[PDB]
Amino acid sequence: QIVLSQSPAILSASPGEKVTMTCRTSSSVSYMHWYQQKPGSSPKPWIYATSNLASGVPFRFSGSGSGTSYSLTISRVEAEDAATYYCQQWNSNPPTFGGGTKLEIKRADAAPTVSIFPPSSEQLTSGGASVVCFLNNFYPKDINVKWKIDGSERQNGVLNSWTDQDSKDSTYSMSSTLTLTKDEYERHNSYTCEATHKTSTSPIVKSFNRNE
Amino acid sequence: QIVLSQSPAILSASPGEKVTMTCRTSSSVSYMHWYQQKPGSSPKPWIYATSNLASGVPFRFSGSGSGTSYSLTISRVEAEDAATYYCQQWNSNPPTFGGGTKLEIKRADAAPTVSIFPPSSEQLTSGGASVVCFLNNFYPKDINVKWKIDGSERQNGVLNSWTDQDSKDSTYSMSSTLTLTKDEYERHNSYTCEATHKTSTSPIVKSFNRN
Amino acid sequence: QVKLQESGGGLVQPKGSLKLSCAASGFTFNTYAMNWVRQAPGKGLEWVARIRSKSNNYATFYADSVKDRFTISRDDSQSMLYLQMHNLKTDDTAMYYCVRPSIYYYASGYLDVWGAGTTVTVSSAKTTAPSVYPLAPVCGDTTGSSVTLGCLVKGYFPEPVTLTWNSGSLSSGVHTFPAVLQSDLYTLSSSVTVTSSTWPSQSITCNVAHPASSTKVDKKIEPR
Amino acid sequence: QVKLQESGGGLVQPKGSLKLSCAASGFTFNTYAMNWVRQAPGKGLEWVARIRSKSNNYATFYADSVKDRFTISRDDSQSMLYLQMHNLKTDDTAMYYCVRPSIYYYASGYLDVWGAGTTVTVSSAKTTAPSVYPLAPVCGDTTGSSVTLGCLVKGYFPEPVTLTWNSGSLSSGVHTFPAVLQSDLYTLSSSVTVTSSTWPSQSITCNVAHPASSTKVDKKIEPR
Amino acid sequence: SVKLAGNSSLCPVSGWAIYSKDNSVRIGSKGDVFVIREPFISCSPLECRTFFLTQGALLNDKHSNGTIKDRSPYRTLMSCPIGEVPSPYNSRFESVAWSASACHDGINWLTIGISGPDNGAVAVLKYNGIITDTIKSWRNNILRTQESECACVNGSCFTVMTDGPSNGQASYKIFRIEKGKIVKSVEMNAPNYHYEECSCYPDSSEITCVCRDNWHGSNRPWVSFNQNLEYQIGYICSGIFGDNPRPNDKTGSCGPVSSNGANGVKGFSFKYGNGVWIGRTKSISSRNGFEMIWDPNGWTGTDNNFSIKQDIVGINEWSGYSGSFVQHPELTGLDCIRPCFWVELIRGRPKENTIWTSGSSISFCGVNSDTVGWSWPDGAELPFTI
Amino acid sequence: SVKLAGNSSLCPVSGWAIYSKDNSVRIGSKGDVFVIREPFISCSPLECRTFFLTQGALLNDKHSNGTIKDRSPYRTLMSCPIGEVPSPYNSRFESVAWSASACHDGINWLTIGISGPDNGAVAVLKYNGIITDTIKSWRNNILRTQESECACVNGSCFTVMTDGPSNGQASYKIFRIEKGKIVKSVEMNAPNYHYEECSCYPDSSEITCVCRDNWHGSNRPWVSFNQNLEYQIGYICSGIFGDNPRPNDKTGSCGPVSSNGANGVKGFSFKYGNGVWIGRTKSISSRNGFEMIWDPNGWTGTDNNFSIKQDIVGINEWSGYSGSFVQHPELTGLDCIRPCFWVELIRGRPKENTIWTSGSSISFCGVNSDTVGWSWPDGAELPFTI
Ligand SMILES: *[C@@H]1O[C@H](CO)[C@@H](O[C@@H]2O[C@H](CO)[C@@H](O)[C@H](O)[C@H]2NC(C)=O)[C@H](O)[C@H]1NC(C)=O
Ligand SMILES: *[C@@H]1O[C@H](CO)[C@@H](O[C@@H]2O[C@H](CO)[C@@H](O)[C@H](O)[C@H]2NC(C)=O)[C@H](O)[C@H]1NC(C)=O
Ligand SMILES: *[C@@H]1O[C@H](CO)[C@@H](O)[C@H](O)[C@H]1NC(C)=O
Ligand SMILES: *[C@@H]1O[C@H](CO)[C@@H](O)[C@H](O)[C@H]1NC(C)=O
Ligand SMILES: *[C@@H]1O[C@H](CO)[C@@H](O)[C@H](O)[C@H]1NC(C)=O
Ligand SMILES: *[C@@H]1O[C@H](CO)[C@@H](O)[C@H](O)[C@H]1NC(C)=O
Ligand SMILES: [Ca+2]
Ligand SMILES: [Ca+2]
Ligand SMILES: [Ca+2]
Ligand SMILES: [Ca+2]
């Protein structure tokens, strides 16, 4: 019933920048705790009672506030700091958490490296036909894929998946899978992927024809 | 986990007799409560803290004991007292009840009044054939029914139901239902009920033939 | 008058859920711990759960036989007690009672008010309607002073059924027999005995109702 | 080291039941209150339940969203915490965490230890095995020094799947893409990029495992 | 001014925090400090004190020559404030005793001091240092008692005494003592058990005693009883064996484990439901080290699994007797009886080359809060001048 | 019986009058006196006492061999009446500790004693000598605290603790302690400051702490805060630099003066508006001498001008740690909090040829009345026969 609102929802920062994230409460509390979550692992206890750092947390972090306003600050952000930070209170029952602030790393733009892949033999023999396109290692994350069959845009039978920001190099990747029947695949010559991304005014294109 | 054992399980008494029922505990308690249940209604609060009578309980009742032994006594038992009496403790969690002592009224022997009934027309038309026998108003409760079809004992397709001791007159009643297919009913002339009861050395018999 | 009217009804399948409720009146519900105690058909009494007053933080306690399946709760502003039952078993079939305990320090545990129960049946058998067959004496005797008639109720489920005679005006020399279960169908019967001048003279009729199937049958007892 | 290893998770149908457990070690479990906190896929954190120590009478507290359906409990002599879930809904699908709270008076509510967690999926969809299709580049596209291969996993349920390359020896220049659900079947993919002298030279093979169907497929990436 | 209720239960406890250390022997190198042994602790509603048995002699003086039999007429029971060195200048006289016990009932101290010959020893009971009762040996064979604090509840204090062989069946008595007068005495019927040097504590109006089996048990025997001396008995089931010497840890017994069961040390443990906090030496053959172990089902179960161990003295340093003591609500402010403990760190003979034998002491108190393993050993460099 | 209000301000003070001197080391030449260090003072509403850290050994005995690491398991925190020699015969045991603090809240004593390993030290808090709380190392690097009295106000007592490197950025916490239980804890955000060995005092319901910068400051850092631990920070601006070692006096800074900023000594100062009473060694390189200086605008201004200096120990004599302590109205009868101070006079190693290292102590109390400069040095002739 006590509500926590964290701002901003997403926060992008260059390594070395100072950053602050905020946590407001609908009504007053004595102090605030915070946790750090990276994808695929449990939250880590990050700070307690507003300002106390958990063992292993480096000095770059500091926590402040009182009444209904609290915050967490990173003096010089590093790439390993990218995660989601949740605040949490237990002044009265029940305990409640904020919505999280997701921290992202800024970096130089990167165009995608596009690869295209026909249906495997093994899938064809079972009556399916999937065509895959990977648009890997790009920045920023906004990207658009267009499929074409013999030149006609094709919208149905497509599934897309985007990766988290990578840890080594801060880029994003995407995967697109145009899935058809074996019968409908064999009625057509050319299959094409069309990547659109701010780094280029022309789309990045990859294509193959069935005969080869 | 604290266990209560009531003795006896059943108790038969003439009106006017003094009666005592006991409740033992596996380990010690400060006091005992008791409740009265007649069939088809909720228990009534009967006695609290060993000796205190609940409003409406008459003085014939009294409750005693301590440690691991308690009892409930009726100085001059009456017919309305027939019920089941449960003890209950709450000295420690969880609260527990005893197994109950069922109080019954004794009385003069009574032979049954036996009636026999063929399948109705309404049931026949739907393919069933049930034959009913009522052995009503008898004492004591031990009674045995034998079915016979053209003279052969018949055991399958029988359902029996016995009543509680009646409140007005202290008797028991029973109902027995031999149920067959319309086809098998029609292959036979005579249907018979055979009541055996200590009040007579010959069975009480009722019969009909299918005309 | 203090009263506890429970409700929340009857038939449900094994593994099922049910929410029993109890409406209290005549006292300050908010000041009292409250209890559910139950009773299997033909068996005795078993405490199931206890919830405390606000001033003891609504603390809850459970019988082992029910632990992890049942939850007890209250809404003081509406004078209600609740028992949520999950993962029901055929053992949990029983009459369920709403039960106030004595406020007396010197009689801790005395349960000073009981409701009528609410009946819970846990079964995979299905709701079936009865058949009501009039029973008249055999075609022949026409003898003694008195005479015995009958009414037979077959192939219903679940309990209960109501059986009366001429709508209840007749209750002398009646025996209504306990129902008995056979292949997940119940059967029951009832004899009525009268003076043989009153019958076939006056109309004798049996009246059976089966709430669970919404049936109401009258049946007249004609000679043959 | 203080550790909380939870277990019991799995796939189960709406209306179903599940009993999650947690084994604690490294501390005196009996001195601590304990907690379950959960997290729906992609969605953030929600406290569900709290049970207290013996010395506070094992008092239990619940989130409204879970009240009357979930029961929390402990066995101190075995260092176990339990959560019994009844009447499951698709909303209750989530990663469930065993969580110790701080003994610090000056930081009431700080949750100082979390377990890895156990996964709960609530769905009427049924357990299906995947298909694993090797993906090689189109023949004739040989040019650049580097080359991208691929592995595609289709039509399984539920999560998760394990996907590796040459049993994990290859983890450079890999992207493994999130699964996506479509008509109650999941799909996922994974590219690997290498030097074009290393392939087709050396064997590159994808290794996929699906615990929930007990499948383990190796797949070699041949040219054509 | 007011008797201790003793009706609350034991404080839940996640670990042990250091409370005192006297450094007797290091200081006694130069100071005027008694040669001591059996250095137990017991607390008032106002202060905690260490009680001990002197030989009536000082570290680094010829009379510390340990040729004297253990049960001499020179041995006395004295006390000093907790953590101070036992010195003739800062110590209170209590009783002439070669075996002893002591506890406070909320109003005054009771002491119990046994002296006299082996075949006829007499315990003398004092209350506020005034002799209030006595009890003679009843098996004529080294009447002896706790070597740690008795336990008081509801104005009555409780102890255990043993008379008989130390290597066969003997006779065990529990006593209820009121204002220093024995009011009840029960001879326990415990065939095939041996009780010696019991560590008794109060817990919910009942007393529990964990003792030493010197005859044939490497797990510790326990006895527990209420104010009427209605008792029960057993042995700690945990396969984390408690005595010294003892075998390596394996499946335990709820009767005496005969394997390395002969001899022992005074020790203690604290019961929590089915669980147990165990104090014990680290070495399995010798009185070296000390660790505390929490075994959640250890009181009543026989396996080796424990949830946590906390170091107290390193395996490589000398230890010795250990014992319980508690702090009541009336002293602490709490709603529960706080368990603590003390450890004797024996220096000199028989393990080292000196003419004497003296203890230093450490103590800890249980808390439900942060703590750490370490080693807090005696630290005297032996031998001395003498 | 009644908690100290702590609400009045500091007594105006024109100079410093001698209060005590123990002559420990001169006496210890023959007596039974502890080797000690960190000899701070703190006062109750009834009496003032000196607290100190023993190595658990006596002057002129082999165990005074100073080869022992500073943070041993033998080290304990004890107290004796003010101006008496710290002796095993006249001293009270307090805590097992190698770093400590202490203060009285008007009702009982609080002690804080840190022991355990470098990577996992635990402070143990006692209230009336009963363990009431604990706190573990949170940076796993020599949790340590004041080595002088905490400050109490309105029934709460306040302290500062440091965990981390001693020659780089570390972590600094302030705590509000109430009846010996930590009720609030704040991690200060002070990048490029180093706080160690803080001298804290109360003044108008707020606490002010003057500490040691061991990383890179020869002026002293301060932190001050109210009962809610809302704090502020800085460094003493005066160009009369306070630490040791330090440069010659020149223009000061309101941040750390890096010049000779590495290492230091525990010290103290008292704030009066923009002014400051400064205690410091006389030598600029070494722990020799002691003087008090009044600099009227020294708290907030950076010049060298002072109005008066008062000699305490001659430049030619050995000094060491120094610390604040105060006397409340509840003890003195006054309408103000009287500031005093104590000085450790270190003898032995590393500066002289002995196997040991021990402090003597002196103290003074501020008065608004006549006083005189002098030298009151230790006065022991070294070395000793050991
Ligand atoms: C606490 O102590 C008092 C005094 O020792 C106990 O009082 C005695 O109780 C017994 C039976 O319970 C009586 O027969 C005695 O005559 C009582 N003595 C006095 C002076 O009143 C009391 O029972 C003890 N309480 C508990 C809980 O054990
Ligand atoms: C002096 O101490 C008392 C007790 O520590 C303080 O009283 C507390 O005040 C806060 C807010 O000011 C309340 O929220 C607490 O609940 C109070 N506690 C009690 C026991 O009354 C008081 O505020 C302090 N006074 C000053 C001037 O700081
Ligand atoms: C002990 O007695 C006190 C005083 O009557 C009581 O309030 C307290 O709850 C009792 N404690 C226990 C644990 O039984
Ligand atoms: C101790 O006693 C032994 C045995 O009688 C003797 O030889 C030795 O000299 C004694 N030592 C001292 C210092 O008195
Ligand atoms: C401190 O408090 C007392 C008692 O309430 C008051 O009379 C006194 O003047 C106060 N002093 C200051 C400086 O506030
Ligand atoms: C002091 O300690 C050292 C280190 O163990 C040792 O070598 C030395 O001999 C000792 N010196 C004296 C005088 O005790
Ligand atoms: Ca033994
Ligand atoms: Ca075990
Ligand atoms: Ca410095
Ligand atoms: Ca100046």
Q: Taking CB atoms and an 8 Å cutoff, what residues of chain A touch D106?
A: 49
Q: H-type helices in E280-355, by residue range?
A: 329-332
Residue keyed to tokens 């039999």: E69
Task: Specify the residue for token string 């029947």.
Answer: A181
CA-based nearest residue to E180, from E245, E241, E95, E69: E95
F144 is in an annotated binding site: no
Q: State yes or no: cis peptide before B94, omega within 30 of 0.
A: yes
Q: Which residues contact A56 (CB under 8 A, 6 or more apart)?
A: none
Q: How far apart are CA C99 and CA C109, in angstroms?
A: 11
**Which of B84, E333, B32 has the alpha carbon at shortest distance from C107?**
B32
B3 and B31 assigned to the same domain: yes
C-alpha neighbours within 13 Å on the C-beta side of residue C6: 28
Catalytic residue, candidates F127, F172, F235, F321: F321
Chain A neighbours (≥3 Cβ pairs under 8 A) are D, F
What does this entry list as its resolution, in Å? 2.8
Range of the domain at E224: 1-386
d(CA E116, CA B80): 77
The answer to whether E85 and E28 are in contact (CB under 8 A) is yes
Cβ–Cβ contacts within 10 Å for residue F109, how many? 21
Q: How far is the CA of E293 from the centre of ligand 9 (A)?
A: 45
Q: Determine the 3-state secondary structure of B23 from DSSP.
A: strand
d(C-alpha E230, C-alpha B62), whole Å: 34
End-to-end Cα spacing for chain F: 47
Q: And the tokens for D108?
A: 């009431």
Nearest to D60 among C17, C60, C84 (CB): C60
C-D contacts (CB, under 8 Å): 30
Residues of chain D with Cβ-Cβ distance to F182 below 8 Å are 104-106
Of how many residues is chain F composed?
386
The token pair at E37 is: 């042994």
- Nearest Cα neighbor of D85 from D158, D4, D8, D6 is D8
Shared domain check, A64 and A9? yes
Q: Which of F61, F70, F74, F118 is catalytic?
A: F70
Cβ(F108)–Cβ(F117) below 8 Å: no
- The answer to whether residues A48 and A115 belong to one domain is no
Structural domains in chain F (count):
1
Q: CA–CA separation, E328 vs D67, rounded Å?
A: 40
* Whether residue B141 sits in one domain with residue B77: no
Same fold flag, D1-124 and D125-224 = yes
For A137-167, give one letter per residue: b (16+ CB within 10 A) or e: bbbbeebebbbbbeeeebeebebebbbebbe
Asked, as a colleague might, if the bond just before E245 is cis with ω within 30 of 0, I would say: yes
> For ligand 1, which residues put their CB under 6 angstroms from it?
E 154-155, 227
Same domain, A94 and A30: yes
The token pair at C177 is 């027999």
F235 is catalytic: no
Q: Which of F136, F142, F186 is nearest to F164 (CA)?
A: F142
Q: For residue E106, what is the domain's CATH number?
A: 2.120.10.10
**Minimal-distance CA residue to ligand 5 atom 1:** F7
Backbone angles phi, psi at F101, to 5 degrees: -150, 165
Q: Which chains have at least 3 CB atom pairs separated by less than 8 Å from chain E? A: D, F
**What contacts D16, CB < 8 A, 6 or more positions away?**
D88, D122
E98 Cα: distance to centroid of ligand 4 (angstroms): 22
Please report, for chain D, the start and end positions of each structural domain, with discontinuous segments joined by +: 1-124, 125-224
Query: How would DSSP label each residue in A143-183?
Result: -EEEEEETTEE--TTEEEEEPPPPTTT--EEEEEEEEEEHH
Contact E188, E173 (CB under 8 A): yes
Tell the residue number behind the tokens 């069946």, with chain if given: E169
Strands C180-182 and B19-25: unpaired
Interface of E with D (CB under 8 A): 9, 11-15, 272-275, 294, 296-297, 300-301, 307-308, 336, 368-370
Q: Which two tokens stand for residue E4?
A: 């201790």
Q: Looking at residue E353, what DSSP letter applies? A: S
**Are B45 and C187 in contact (CB < 8 Å)?**
no
Do chains C and B touch by CB distance (3+ pairs < 8 Å)? yes
* CA proximity to F214, closest of F281, F168, F279: F168
Pair of tokens at residue F352: 């002289």
Q: Give the separation between CA F366 and CA E38, rounded to whole angstroms.
A: 50
Q: Which burial class, exposed, middle or buried, applies to A39 when counting CB atoms under 10 A from its CB (0-12, 13-18, 19+)? A: exposed
- Output the six-digit token pair for F10: 């500091």
Quote the CA–CA distance of F256 and F192 in Å, as a whole number: 8
Is CATH 3.40.50.2000 the right assignment for the domain spanning D125-224? no
- The CATH architecture one would assign to domain C1-124 is Sandwich (2.60)
- The CA distance from D125 to D110, in Å, is 38
Length of chain E (residues): 386
Q: Which residues of F are less than 8 Å from D105 in CB distance?
A: 181-183
Rounded-to-integer distance, Cα E311 and Cα E325, Å: 19
Which residue is it, tokens 């817990």?
Answer: E203
Which residue type sits at E227?
A: Q
**D-E Cβ pairs (cutoff 8 Å, strict):** 53
Of E209, E249, E266, nearest in space to E233 by CA: E209
Buried b (16+ CB within 10 A) or exposed e, D161-178: bebbbeeeebeebebbbb
Contact yes or no for E34/E19 (Cβ under 8 A): no
Query: Does residue C31 sit in helix, strand or coil?
Result: helix
Check CB contact under 8 Å for B42 and C188: no
Same domain? A1 vs A103? yes
Q: Is C56 on the interface with D (CB under 8 A)?
A: no
The DSSP symbol for E332 reads H
For B3, half-sphere exposure in the C-beta direction (CA atoms, 13 angstrom radius) is 2
Rounded to whole angstroms, the Cα distance separating C134 from B44 reads 38
- F166 in contact with ligand 5, CB cutoff 6 A: no
Q: Can you tell me the distance from the alpha carbon of E259 to that of E249, in angstroms, rounded to the nearest whole number?
A: 11
Antiparallel, parallel or unpaired: β F92-96 and A158-162? unpaired
Which residue puts its alpha carbon closest to atom 20 of ligand 1?
E155
Question: DSSP character for A163?
Answer: P
Full domain range(s) for residue A162: 108-212
Indicate which technique resolved this structure. X-ray
For D53-67, give the secondary structure using H, E and C.
CHHHCCCEEECCCCC
Tell whether A144 and A201 lie within a shared domain: yes
Per-residue burial over E274-306, b = 16 or more CB atoms within 10 Å of its CB, e = otherwise: bbbbbbbbbbbeebbbbbbbbbbbbbbbbbeeb
H-assigned helices in C66-199: none
Where residue A18 sits, what CATH number does that domain have? 2.60.40.10
The verdict on whether residue F197 carries a ligand-binding annotation is: yes
Is F124 an interface residue toward E (CB < 8 Å)?
yes
Q: How does C164-181 read in b/e, with b if 16+ C-beta sit within 10 Å? A: bbeeeebeebebbbbbbe
Same domain, A34 and A81: yes
State yes or no: is F70 an active-site residue: yes
- A6 and A101 both lie in a single domain: yes
Same structural domain, A52 and A102: yes
Q: Are residues A209 and A123 in the same domain?
A: yes
Q: Which residues contact B176 (CB under 8 A, 6 or more apart)?
A: B132, B133, B134, B135, B145, B147, B158, B159, B160, B193
Task: Name the helix (H) or strand (E) containing E329.
Answer: helix E329-332
Listed residues A107, A139, A171: the one ending a domain? A107
> Do E312 and E318 form a contact (C-beta atoms < 8 A)?
no
Interface mutation vs chain B, best among C138, C141, C171, most B CBs within 10 Å = C138
Ligand 2 within 6 A of F155 CB? yes
Domains identified in chain A, total number: 2
Give the integer Cα–Cα distance in Å for F122 and F113.
8
